[PDB]
């Protein structure tokens, strides 16, 4: 249970990083 929660949080963090990078790129290109 605790292992599942910990690994799920890790996956969520990685996804949040991916989304952050994608949003920054989207903003930069929307300026153009």
């Amino acid at each position: 249970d605790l292992y599942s929660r910990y690994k799920k949080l890790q996956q969520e963090l990685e996804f949040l990083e991916v989304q952050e990078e994608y949003i920054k790129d989207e903003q930069k290109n929307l300026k153009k």
């Binding site: 990685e14 996804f15 991916v18 989304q19 994608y22 949003i23 790129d25 290109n29």
Partner: protein
Amino acid sequence: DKDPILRRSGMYTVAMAYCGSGNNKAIRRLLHVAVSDVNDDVRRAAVESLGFILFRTPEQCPSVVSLLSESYNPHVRYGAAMALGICCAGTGNKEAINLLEPMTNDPVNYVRQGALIASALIMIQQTEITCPKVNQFRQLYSKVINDKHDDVMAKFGAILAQGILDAGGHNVTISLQSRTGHTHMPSVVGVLVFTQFWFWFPLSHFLSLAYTPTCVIGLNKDLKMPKVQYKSNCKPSTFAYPAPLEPEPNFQLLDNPARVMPAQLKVLTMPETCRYQPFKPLSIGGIIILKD
């Protein structure tokens, strides 16, 4: 590559390679291309591929495609629609339906077409009780098909949606993964080549592969049908055919072979009175060999 079609093939190969892997690298590349490329077809393919990449975690595809769906580029909006459809095929996702509902009346005809087809794909086989918007979307399809001052492509999408919602009679569902957790190559290929109907209508006859029967079939020692009757600890109304268009029992019986839905698997049970017994638990579903 410099050819937009070659770049589109690049996006498609990313999808097929990292199909159902949740690969952060692949998602990063797809999103970069979707928000950067100069060709709208390439953007559309890039957004679409995310469904194949993330089909094993349907709860996450909305989290990445909502903003793309609410965008200034109709091609990217259509890509988001189809990405949600592929990601949540045979799942009836509340978030997916909520995202698709605003897009069903988008200004752009092909955006509406994609939204309708994606909604049908997601809500295949789902009843009123299971999903509280299936009847609404059925009426929407009928209205679009009947209106005589609507776009031809929107009508095409509505007709295809009607066809997909009630497929194989009503005894088939679209799932990119088998009941055991393996990627279904026929279904992946079928959905891809069906998505490639934007360029060639005849290719629409590839969702036939994606269609997978939803049935619990019994067998005897000699591999022949036994006349067994399975039990579903669910109300008759829920998990039932919608209707033939012109004290609730808490238990139902189904005859081999039985039209049993993927959600109904969890509840299906066998009556111990009958002489036949299920070798592997009936919750697994599929062809089951019955011991006696």
